[PDB]
Design a protein around this ligand. Structure first.
Ligand SMILES: CCCCCCCCCO[C@@H]1O[C@H](CO)[C@@H](O)[C@H](O)[C@H]1O
Ligand SMILES: CCCCCCCCCO[C@@H]1O[C@H](CO)[C@@H](O)[C@H](O)[C@H]1O
Ligand SMILES: CCCCCCCCCO[C@@H]1O[C@H](CO)[C@@H](O)[C@H](O)[C@H]1O
Ligand SMILES: CCCCCCCCCO[C@@H]1O[C@H](CO)[C@@H](O)[C@H](O)[C@H]1O
Ligand SMILES: OC[C@H]1O[C@@H](O)[C@H](O)[C@@H](O)[C@@H]1O
Length: 476
């Protein structure tokens, strides 16, 4: 509950909007389907081809938007981290209002595409802000707060969706409740109020920018004040000197015309960047978004509306609760060890499920095992790979490519989200065993990847990497 902790709370407000925006549409989609009358032409008003295609575009728009958001964020952060947060809040305020008043597939598609862009901004900005506003020994611990409120956002959106009539019947013709028509729009409108809270927090209490940013553009004295404020100490010679060395290397870098595109042709920098993009993209091959995006579609085959609803609530609850231990584990045991154990937990989840489905595709025992395996996969991901990745991406790079490569890696993550989710939706309908055996193989490969190539980044100074040492960065 330090000061640096009030500051990360201010940044985690955007992380709450992150999680909320990702899961809000999925929660109340069926209501939109009936109201917008996407399948009013056919007998079934909830299940038709038109709904499937348009829902695919809606999900794709968020992912694509997130890709663009991550790319632009690399350029936007240059003018400030706190500035990025302010822009995010102002942006989400209008986008949420716009989404609240949509009446057609095109306007809501446009709204979600924008909402995705804001998400891509949050993906890079918030973990970077927390990175430069916390103690080096407590970076990881607070870095979990980012993932924590993401998880919390996903949970709150599901909880608010319980105020609904728990869904309209697919074969019925009963019109929605006037309350239900109002409430799903209000759910879209809720992050506008949250955005206002985010703006108020930054402009009233947390006016300062990060000490790293302030020092980088000349504000040395003002950098000292915010540095002394977050550390609660008059003597801040060591972290200031760490920033001074990082910034000086940035100045030498700009002189050598070093950029992300230029560093890629340098084998020393290419190595750490490729490793960063690999680790970032491999988070999606855990299949976590397959569950997040299609929680209803996955269990619609052997579970009814009420149980799917209960399952959704419990899944998001566990996904949120199991994030808390990461605050202690990430720093105490390290990031690499947690990643390795996380991969083991993922393997333990998918491989027995793959074997069970291969033996018998329609066994009752398989259905039950699939439910338990879900929670095993959720607990494993929520405690490790989820939180750690965004913490690691802002600890593994030298200062010259610190922000740019982190943005590139974040972009790859959302690109892989497109690569994993949509084909998985097609595969799991044909043969779940094949999809589950691919995830098992990927879980093993990811284990070996981290085990052999990934180094620990705990307690590292700002702008330092375990891969490239200071003197080695000078010859470049
Ligand atoms: C740019 C600000 C616009 C906000 C205007 C709010 C007016 C009252 C909102 O009630 C609206 O009543 C419509 C009747 O057709 C419904 O269709 C629509 O779903 C519902 O939202
Ligand atoms: C960000 C989303 C942008 C979507 C752009 C889609 C452009 C091509 C489709 O245009 C739409 O053709 C419909 C015919 O079905 C018309 O009914 C509707 O009035 C019109 O808008
Ligand atoms: C890691 C957890 C991933 C799960 C997140 C996706 C959950 C999507 C929300 O589902 C919906 O929940 C509503 C209750 O709010 C139900 O009324 C509705 O029937 C159901 O479709
Ligand atoms: C990658 C997202 C899912 C993570 C792992 C959770 C497995 C839960 C899904 O269970 C599977 O549901 C299929 C529905 O098609 C059934 O056919 C199959 O028998 C059953 O095993
Ligand atoms: O909590 C679930 C979320 O965790 C984040 O770490 C992943 O990047 C998201 O794709 C996932 O949806």
């Amino acid at each position: 509950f330090s000061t640096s902790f009030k500051y990360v709370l201010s940044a985690c407000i955007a992380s709450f909007i992150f999680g909320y925006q990702v899961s809000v549409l999925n929660t109340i989609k069926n209501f939109i389907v009936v109201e917008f009358e996407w399948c009013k032409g056919e007998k079934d008003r909830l299940n038709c081809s038109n709904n499937t295609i348009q829902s695919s575009f809606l999900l794709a728009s968020v992912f694509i938007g997130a890709v663009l958001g991550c790319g632009f964020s690399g350029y936007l952060v240059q003018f400030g981290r706190r500035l990025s947060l302010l822009i995010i809040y102002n942006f989400f305020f209008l986008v949420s209002i716009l989404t609240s008043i949509t009446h057609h597939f095109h306007t809501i598609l446009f709204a979600r595409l924008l909402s995705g862009f804001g998400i891509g901004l949050v993906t890079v900005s918030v973990p970077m802000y927390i990175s430069e506003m916390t103690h080096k020994d407590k970076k990881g611990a607070y870095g979990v707060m980012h993932q924590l409120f993401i998880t919390f956002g996903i949970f709150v959106a599901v909880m608010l969706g319980l105020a609904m009539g728990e869904g309209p019947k697919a074969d019925s013709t009963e019109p929605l409740t006037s309350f239900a028509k109002l409430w799903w729009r209000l759910m879209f409108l809720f992050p506008s109020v949250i955005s206002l809270i985010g703006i108020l927090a930054l402009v009233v209490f947390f006016k300062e920018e990060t000490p790293y940013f302030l020092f980088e553009k000349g504000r040395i004295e003002e950098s000292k004040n915010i540095l002394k404020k977050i550390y609660e100490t008059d003597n801040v010679d060591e972290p200031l000197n760490a920033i001074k060395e990082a910034v000086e290397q940035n100045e030498s870098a700009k002189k050598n015309s070093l950029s992300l595109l230029s560093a890629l042709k340098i084998p020393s920098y290419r190595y750490v960047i490729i490793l960063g993009c690999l680790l970032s993209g491999l988070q999606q091959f855990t299949g976590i978004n397959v569950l997040v995006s299609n929680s209803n579609e996955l269990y619609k085959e052997f579970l009814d509306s009420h149980l799917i609803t209960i399952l959704s609530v419990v899944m998001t609850a566990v996904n949120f609760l199991m994030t808390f231990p990461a605050i202690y584990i990430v720093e105490k045991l390290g990031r690499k060890t947690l990643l390795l154990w996380g991969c083991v937990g993922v393997l333990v989840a998918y491989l027995p499920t793959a074997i069970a489905n291969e033996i018998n595709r329609n066994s009752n025992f398989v259905k039950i095992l699939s439910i338990v395996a879900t929670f095993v996969m959720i607990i494993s991901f929520a405690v490790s790979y989820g939180p750690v990745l965004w913490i690691y991406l802002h600890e593994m790079f030298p200062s010259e490519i610190k922000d740019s490569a982190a943005s590139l890696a974040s972009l790859v993550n959302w690109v892989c989200a497109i690569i994993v989710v949509f084909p998985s939706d097609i595969i799991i309908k044909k043969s779940p065993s094949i999809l589950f055996i691919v995830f098992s193989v990927m879980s093993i490969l990811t284990f070996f990847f981290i085990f052999f190539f990934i180094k620990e980044t705990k307690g590292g100074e700002i702008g330092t990497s375990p891969y490239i040492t200071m003197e080695e960065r000078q010859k470049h």
